[PDB]
């Protein structure tokens, strides 16, 4: 049967015919739903499917060129137990992987992704070079450009390339004596691993961490990111004069570097990607999450709000302002940034496009709906279907 | 094995063993997840499980009385195709149904539920008297008390007892010539059905609709709830003087009446229930949903906010204040009301209790997390498992 997807605001109805064609299986079963949980012959089966997707995307499916490519991949697998992608295929696969990310609300821009082929990378030093170049091209002095740099794939009889850091730009997390944490509590483990590997730690709340680059069958090397590459934005509020004084700030480039890029059976343990930040991710998750900076109560007290009772909605009021500050500070600094209203509205446009294009779109409601003002966005009143498609980006265990 | 549930704020882990006893299947499959979607041999099986549950609750499982009750239910079903519930079982079952509602965030009160057995009702006029006494009891002049009135179960040889209204108290929605709607847009269908059945409509924004009660195999009859029975609250803001002048208001008693009560294979098409309001439902959903009262833009303008650009976060700001107005207003009028922070905090408590009690708890993440400031609440960072347990409340097709 075809899942009926309804929008409860407008009453519109569509059918997801793309979900049937979904390969791998998820954690859900007819018995119980786990959708809220954060976490040889086979290879050939996936590769044949990917090649088909590619030739189908250039309207040449069933061609002699299509068959030649299919037979070529099989032969490679028989003689090596693996195979290699053509540039045009990688570029296509990278874009598809993003297009398929169920939790990403910025997919309307999936086709404009710039793919940098770094499969010829020889070492960590060269890896660091690729990363720096990526950061320069992506940051572009404020006018951000979405991009991904694909490093050499996972090959039999050797270790793979890996970026130990969860993101290319992260803030240190120094575990304090009294039990607290100076800086970002989410970066504690990686911060200590940087220290043990020979990094001289600071003592600020926003210290940019070094990159722990790992090459095949080799221990990770520390690499310091030149401050001139790491563009940052000082936070301030349009009417709250004292806000600037809080010394808060955040980086311009959101770059995930710990996810695995899977294309046609092939695995690329290292392939950092980046686009641009959605305000709420900085103002609501990063700055207000309890297990993170937790600056909510501090700002509320400074705003002179009644923090004694929950009924005053001081938390809600303080959060909104922190988010307004992020948006304000980024526009003033002329760094790309999009509020949750514009992001969700565009995603609704993406659904409509994907419905015409593929007859559906894998989406994860819990992730598409922003962490604040949920029902104020169109995506809240829009039913969604979550499923795994390939090519795709996947989570992977830490290299340590 | 059993599902591993995790809280990302604290880091705690648990295993939902209760899910493994799900008496029915859901919409999700390993291929895809549909969690965000809003919508004789079998009889004996469900009935027996229910009776087993009841005897386990009063620590008399396996006793003679237990074995006799089972033979009795089996005998009645063999002779009539159905069976009669003992008063004590009805009370127990009703509580389990609320206890099993995956979408209810106020289930910590499932134990304190008043049950009105009305299985001896014979007419629409008698159905009306029951409901009025229900309202008078639940409202309790402001200090609301949870309640549920159970009407005659579904019989094989006759129609069902139904309550056409989705709630015992709702505001009329009048379609205007200019395409607009005066009143609650969500109530247009039931509003027109009352008119079609002999009721002369009003012309206000908050007209309390008449009850459309239906007796077995008979056309529905109109019934007007005496004004003195419907406790309403005028909406005003603590500092925004102009808010009160908007003439906004909302009823005190939220009583779902269009759902079916399922107990031991027995169906109760009519069994209205009620508790008290969670501010967000009124302040965010009823008043701010684009397809509802849609007061947001007007409130923002009065707030002297800049609605020309989304980044100003005028939508979020106006929403927070509207929600503050609801809370302030109910407290002023001394009508029971709970904010999303106090509610979510009590739900986490309910989880801990259910873990020790039954070893788990069915929950729908999308419904538990409030429509605003989602991540500011504890339930957001709490993973959940959704499954169907019985006794339970289920959706059913409209009587017309
Ligand atoms: C155009 C700018 C973009 C915006 C505004 C955007 C926004 C978001 C948001 C709000 C989330 C959910 C929260 C989170 O997971 O941290 C997310 C997740 C995700 N996005 Fe996008 N994104 C953008 C570009 C990209 C690009 C270029 C890719 C891939 C090539 C991508 C891949 C993903 C993936 C894989 C996730 C889930 C992994 C994770 O938890 O971090 N995004 N994005
Ligand atoms: C004590 C006060 C209560 C509060 C604060 C509360 C709050 C909520 C909220 C916020 C929802 C989600 C909104 C919605 O689905 O419309 C909900 C849903 C639900 N509640 Fe509760 N609730 C309360 C009492 C009750 C009682 C007394 C029962 C049953 C005896 C109950 C049964 C349900 C059910 C079945 C749902 C799903 C409703 C639906 O289908 O829309 N609730 N509740
Ligand atoms: O903006 N965001 O919230 C966000 C979250 C997670 C990943 C990315 C990327 Br890549 N660009 N922006 C992101
Ligand atoms: O998923 N949805 O389409 C959807 C629409 C309207 C309300 C809700 C709630 Br509450 N959870 N999910 C919803
Ligand atoms: O308080 N609420 O938001 C709410 C929503 C939906 C149903 C009920 C009942 Br029954 N009591 N309170 C409710
Ligand atoms: O923590 N959680 O259980 C959880 C469930 C569903 C979505 C999210 C997001 Br986005 N952050 N945390 C989540
Ligand atoms: Zn599911």
mmCIF file of N, CA and C in Angstrom, chain A residues 121-177:
data_model
loop_
_atom_site.group_PDB
_atom_site.id
_atom_site.type_symbol
_atom_site.label_atom_id
_atom_site.label_comp_id
_atom_site.label_asym_id
_atom_site.label_seq_id
_atom_site.Cartn_x
_atom_site.Cartn_y
_atom_site.Cartn_z
ATOM 1 N N UNK A 121 44.116 11.916 -1.961
ATOM 2 C CA UNK A 121 44.812 12.358 -0.751
ATOM 3 C C UNK A 121 45.813 11.322 -0.285
ATOM 4 N N UNK A 122 47.050 11.758 -0.075
ATOM 5 C CA UNK A 122 48.110 10.850 0.353
ATOM 6 C C UNK A 122 48.413 10.789 1.854
ATOM 7 N N UNK A 123 48.143 11.873 2.580
ATOM 8 C CA UNK A 123 48.419 11.898 4.020
ATOM 9 C C UNK A 123 47.580 12.913 4.792
ATOM 10 N N UNK A 124 47.842 12.987 6.094
ATOM 11 C CA UNK A 124 47.150 13.900 6.985
ATOM 12 C C UNK A 124 47.478 15.358 6.650
ATOM 13 N N UNK A 125 48.720 15.598 6.240
ATOM 14 C CA UNK A 125 49.188 16.929 5.875
ATOM 15 C C UNK A 125 48.388 17.415 4.669
ATOM 16 N N UNK A 126 48.221 16.536 3.684
ATOM 17 C CA UNK A 126 47.448 16.856 2.494
ATOM 18 C C UNK A 126 45.969 16.962 2.865
ATOM 19 N N UNK A 127 45.538 16.142 3.819
ATOM 20 C CA UNK A 127 44.151 16.157 4.277
ATOM 21 C C UNK A 127 43.857 17.550 4.878
ATOM 22 N N UNK A 128 44.799 18.048 5.686
ATOM 23 C CA UNK A 128 44.682 19.346 6.333
ATOM 24 C C UNK A 128 44.638 20.448 5.299
ATOM 25 N N UNK A 129 45.359 20.236 4.207
ATOM 26 C CA UNK A 129 45.385 21.203 3.124
ATOM 27 C C UNK A 129 43.991 21.261 2.482
ATOM 28 N N UNK A 130 43.403 20.093 2.218
ATOM 29 C CA UNK A 130 42.080 20.004 1.617
ATOM 30 C C UNK A 130 41.015 20.662 2.499
ATOM 31 N N UNK A 131 41.123 20.424 3.802
ATOM 32 C CA UNK A 131 40.180 20.967 4.755
ATOM 33 C C UNK A 131 40.232 22.483 4.801
ATOM 34 N N UNK A 132 41.451 23.026 4.818
ATOM 35 C CA UNK A 132 41.651 24.473 4.872
ATOM 36 C C UNK A 132 41.097 25.104 3.618
ATOM 37 N N UNK A 133 41.333 24.452 2.488
ATOM 38 C CA UNK A 133 40.842 24.950 1.216
ATOM 39 C C UNK A 133 39.319 24.913 1.202
ATOM 40 N N UNK A 134 38.751 23.866 1.798
ATOM 41 C CA UNK A 134 37.302 23.695 1.884
ATOM 42 C C UNK A 134 36.722 24.867 2.692
ATOM 43 N N UNK A 135 37.298 25.101 3.877
ATOM 44 C CA UNK A 135 36.872 26.178 4.767
ATOM 45 C C UNK A 135 36.947 27.536 4.083
ATOM 46 N N UNK A 136 37.974 27.765 3.268
ATOM 47 C CA UNK A 136 38.091 29.037 2.570
ATOM 48 C C UNK A 136 37.005 29.209 1.514
ATOM 49 N N UNK A 137 36.797 28.172 0.712
ATOM 50 C CA UNK A 137 35.796 28.213 -0.337
ATOM 51 C C UNK A 137 34.390 28.320 0.244
ATOM 52 N N UNK A 138 34.119 27.554 1.299
ATOM 53 C CA UNK A 138 32.807 27.550 1.931
ATOM 54 C C UNK A 138 32.482 28.827 2.689
ATOM 55 N N UNK A 139 33.458 29.337 3.432
ATOM 56 C CA UNK A 139 33.215 30.536 4.219
ATOM 57 C C UNK A 139 33.026 31.737 3.331
ATOM 58 N N UNK A 140 33.884 31.840 2.320
ATOM 59 C CA UNK A 140 33.847 32.911 1.322
ATOM 60 C C UNK A 140 33.591 34.296 1.929
ATOM 61 N N UNK A 141 34.310 34.598 3.016
ATOM 62 C CA UNK A 141 34.219 35.886 3.706
ATOM 63 C C UNK A 141 32.816 36.279 4.122
ATOM 64 N N UNK A 142 32.012 35.288 4.474
ATOM 65 C CA UNK A 142 30.654 35.592 4.893
ATOM 66 C C UNK A 142 29.572 35.033 4.001
ATOM 67 N N UNK A 143 29.715 35.159 2.682
ATOM 68 C CA UNK A 143 28.712 34.640 1.748
ATOM 69 C C UNK A 143 28.946 33.134 1.585
ATOM 70 N N UNK A 144 28.462 32.361 2.548
ATOM 71 C CA UNK A 144 28.658 30.918 2.565
ATOM 72 C C UNK A 144 28.191 30.114 1.345
ATOM 73 N N UNK A 145 28.943 29.065 1.034
ATOM 74 C CA UNK A 145 28.638 28.185 -0.078
ATOM 75 C C UNK A 145 28.693 26.750 0.418
ATOM 76 N N UNK A 146 27.619 26.003 0.186
ATOM 77 C CA UNK A 146 27.544 24.608 0.616
ATOM 78 C C UNK A 146 28.559 23.744 -0.149
ATOM 79 N N UNK A 147 29.276 22.891 0.568
ATOM 80 C CA UNK A 147 30.257 22.061 -0.077
ATOM 81 C C UNK A 147 30.638 20.825 0.729
ATOM 82 N N UNK A 148 31.279 19.865 0.056
ATOM 83 C CA UNK A 148 31.722 18.632 0.673
ATOM 84 C C UNK A 148 32.998 18.168 -0.003
ATOM 85 N N UNK A 149 33.948 17.709 0.801
ATOM 86 C CA UNK A 149 35.225 17.229 0.285
ATOM 87 C C UNK A 149 35.293 15.753 0.598
ATOM 88 N N UNK A 150 35.297 14.940 -0.450
ATOM 89 C CA UNK A 150 35.343 13.489 -0.293
ATOM 90 C C UNK A 150 36.766 12.942 -0.322
ATOM 91 N N UNK A 151 37.204 12.386 0.804
ATOM 92 C CA UNK A 151 38.532 11.767 0.925
ATOM 93 C C UNK A 151 38.456 10.289 0.510
ATOM 94 N N UNK A 152 39.622 9.628 0.262
ATOM 95 C CA UNK A 152 39.713 8.215 -0.154
ATOM 96 C C UNK A 152 38.814 7.283 0.628
ATOM 97 N N UNK A 153 38.142 6.409 -0.104
ATOM 98 C CA UNK A 153 37.214 5.452 0.464
ATOM 99 C C UNK A 153 37.859 4.357 1.322
ATOM 100 N N UNK A 154 37.009 3.581 1.985
ATOM 101 C CA UNK A 154 37.458 2.488 2.824
ATOM 102 C C UNK A 154 37.893 1.331 1.887
ATOM 103 N N UNK A 155 39.161 0.928 2.000
ATOM 104 C CA UNK A 155 39.719 -0.146 1.172
ATOM 105 C C UNK A 155 40.240 -1.322 1.996
ATOM 106 N N UNK A 156 40.014 -2.556 1.529
ATOM 107 C CA UNK A 156 40.441 -3.792 2.186
ATOM 108 C C UNK A 156 41.954 -3.824 2.527
ATOM 109 N N UNK A 157 42.261 -4.386 3.696
ATOM 110 C CA UNK A 157 43.633 -4.499 4.141
ATOM 111 C C UNK A 157 44.374 -3.209 4.465
ATOM 112 N N UNK A 158 43.686 -2.276 5.129
ATOM 113 C CA UNK A 158 44.257 -0.990 5.544
ATOM 114 C C UNK A 158 43.261 -0.126 6.314
ATOM 115 N N UNK A 159 43.799 0.796 7.109
ATOM 116 C CA UNK A 159 42.971 1.702 7.893
ATOM 117 C C UNK A 159 42.435 2.790 6.990
ATOM 118 N N UNK A 160 41.356 3.442 7.407
ATOM 119 C CA UNK A 160 40.760 4.500 6.589
ATOM 120 C C UNK A 160 41.102 5.893 7.090
ATOM 121 N N UNK A 161 40.828 6.894 6.259
ATOM 122 C CA UNK A 161 41.048 8.290 6.643
ATOM 123 C C UNK A 161 39.938 8.666 7.625
ATOM 124 N N UNK A 162 40.249 9.462 8.640
ATOM 125 C CA UNK A 162 39.246 9.865 9.618
ATOM 126 C C UNK A 162 39.500 11.221 10.253
ATOM 127 N N UNK A 163 38.417 11.956 10.486
ATOM 128 C CA UNK A 163 38.495 13.252 11.148
ATOM 129 C C UNK A 163 37.869 12.984 12.502
ATOM 130 N N UNK A 164 38.702 12.927 13.534
ATOM 131 C CA UNK A 164 38.216 12.645 14.896
ATOM 132 C C UNK A 164 37.170 13.633 15.409
ATOM 133 N N UNK A 165 37.291 14.892 14.991
ATOM 134 C CA UNK A 165 36.365 15.945 15.401
ATOM 135 C C UNK A 165 34.976 15.743 14.806
ATOM 136 N N UNK A 166 33.942 16.042 15.592
ATOM 137 C CA UNK A 166 32.563 15.911 15.136
ATOM 138 C C UNK A 166 32.246 17.005 14.115
ATOM 139 N N UNK A 167 32.894 18.150 14.268
ATOM 140 C CA UNK A 167 32.714 19.257 13.336
ATOM 141 C C UNK A 167 34.079 19.865 13.111
ATOM 142 N N UNK A 168 34.261 20.488 11.951
ATOM 143 C CA UNK A 168 35.527 21.126 11.601
ATOM 144 C C UNK A 168 35.846 22.279 12.547
ATOM 145 N N UNK A 169 34.815 22.985 12.999
ATOM 146 C CA UNK A 169 34.994 24.096 13.925
ATOM 147 C C UNK A 169 34.187 23.779 15.170
ATOM 148 N N UNK A 170 34.886 23.545 16.279
ATOM 149 C CA UNK A 170 34.262 23.206 17.559
ATOM 150 C C UNK A 170 34.899 24.031 18.662
ATOM 151 N N UNK A 171 34.157 24.235 19.747
ATOM 152 C CA UNK A 171 34.671 24.987 20.891
ATOM 153 C C UNK A 171 35.074 24.031 21.995
ATOM 154 N N UNK A 172 36.235 24.285 22.582
ATOM 155 C CA UNK A 172 36.758 23.447 23.659
ATOM 156 C C UNK A 172 35.823 23.297 24.858
ATOM 157 N N UNK A 173 35.987 22.180 25.553
ATOM 158 C CA UNK A 173 35.199 21.903 26.727
ATOM 159 C C UNK A 173 36.125 21.410 27.821
ATOM 160 N N UNK A 174 36.526 22.320 28.706
ATOM 161 C CA UNK A 174 37.427 21.999 29.812
ATOM 162 C C UNK A 174 36.637 21.562 31.033
ATOM 163 N N UNK A 175 36.834 20.315 31.455
ATOM 164 C CA UNK A 175 36.142 19.790 32.634
ATOM 165 C C UNK A 175 36.723 20.492 33.866
ATOM 166 N N UNK A 176 35.862 21.181 34.610
ATOM 167 C CA UNK A 176 36.303 21.903 35.796
ATOM 168 C C UNK A 176 36.499 21.045 37.036
ATOM 169 N N UNK A 177 37.242 21.600 37.988
ATOM 170 C CA UNK A 177 37.557 20.939 39.253
ATOM 171 C C UNK A 177 36.307 20.648 40.088
#
